[PDB]
Design a protein around this ligand. Sequence first.
Ligand code: A1AHU
Ligand code: A1AHU
Lengths: 221, 233
Amino acid sequence: LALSLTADQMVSALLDAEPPILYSEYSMMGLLTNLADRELVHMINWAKRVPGFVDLTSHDQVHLLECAWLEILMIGLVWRSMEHPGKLLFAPNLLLDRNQMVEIFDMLLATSSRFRMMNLQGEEFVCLKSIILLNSGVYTFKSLEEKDHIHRVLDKITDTLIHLMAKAGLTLQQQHQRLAQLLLILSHIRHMSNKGMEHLYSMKCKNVVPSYDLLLEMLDA
Amino acid sequence: LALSLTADQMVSALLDAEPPILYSEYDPTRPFSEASMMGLLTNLADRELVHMINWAKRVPGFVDLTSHDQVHLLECAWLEILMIGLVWRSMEHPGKLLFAPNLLLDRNQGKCVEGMVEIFDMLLATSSRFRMMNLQGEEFVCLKSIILLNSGVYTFSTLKSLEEKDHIHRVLDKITDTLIHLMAKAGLTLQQQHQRLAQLLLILSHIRHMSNKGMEHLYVVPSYDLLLEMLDA
Ligand SMILES: O=S(=O)([C@@H]1C[C@@H]2O[C@H]1C(c1ccc(O)cc1)=C2c1ccc(O)cc1)N1CCCc2ccccc21
Ligand SMILES: O=S(=O)([C@@H]1C[C@@H]2O[C@H]1C(c1ccc(O)cc1)=C2c1ccc(O)cc1)N1CCCc2ccccc21
């Protein structure tokens, strides 16, 4: 069914699957871990709604989640903070400036400024967040049939991004230029995820990273 | 004048700029130890680096940047650039990484450095992906230039600094134009063109991942001062 969707159907699906913006519950690391943990529960249920994701085996679903989770968290943060220059909107009651580790903060800030400079639209945002889910773990995996399916869904999402842009009036040159601009930021999101994951470790927080079994269990629930 | 180039002139510039293929040390002691394999790899990478700076200086637009920004882009990109070169050299050697014509390593050989094998498998997967896609040489040089300009652009305050970033993004747009031109010229439909562009750019995210994972183990890394001195020479 996912491969028969039109660009409008794809966008409508992803917009309806969007998680809500959560609040923090009242240390800073404690507040952020608690927020991320509640965000993770919504992310599984969002992932199940990304067209094509539930066609994969449970093992492959876990592997993609297991690789994309912090990138998804981060891209959501950068989206939330777009309209707050100089600050990261972890939650509406948890808005941070740099003075409040700083290297990654600055990288997140730069990404928000870039989305702002590009006038990133929410319909584009949801497509990119789906791309991360399906792409981040695909090169590190039935497996053949599974990878083929993932790449066909990814092509569907490209088509949808191009359709969105054409509908907005972008020339053909502009469509491809913007498509390349958006995807290249995904290489910066990966970078930031890997450094975040390195920073979690150096803070002695290797325990907050969701394990394969946690994801599998959350997904079977 | 970099942004005045046509697509055909960009491809020609990038092809002419390609670095040479170097050899590894001749007849090393085999089987390798951890230390010895690392030694060989470090020595090869150190010598590749010099030619990488020569190549970088010929990537259109690169020398319009300040020396400080040129070094910053190379600090961020060098390992990704070495890795994409490795993956390209290895396309026609499934299951194997052609570090040099005289250093062709399979997976079991990666195990000799604890933790290496996981990056080894990622590199082999990327080479299989390029084979599956029938990556063309002209496309490869465009990709490798994208990594140089993009990897460090987001971590550059002043009018000049915004002009530097704007210049980088404009050159990146030109290379996008060039990739599309190559694809259209090959006969791909518009739909195919956009799909193939996305597929190529998404592989860049994986190469970044591998570079992050390998840099972690490096912690060998070329210093700011080394790169600056090489750039002025
Ligand atoms: O890289 S960080 O360690 C990590 C990435 C991002 O910020 C942190 C975090 C997180 C993830 C899962 C955890 O269990 C706990 C924390 C992130 C995050 C959380 C929710 C969200 O919706 C989006 C992103 N980091 C650097 C910059 C600022 C900062 C301040 C305090 C502590 C850490 C950091
Ligand atoms: O990703 S790795 O860090 C990096 C990729 C490739 O293998 C390594 C290497 C390299 C780079 C610079 C060095 O000074 C030394 C080694 C590589 C290399 C790639 C292209 C090229 O043209 C020349 C060298 N890595 C995996 C394999 C074994 C290994 C063992 C210990 C820690 C890391 C790794």
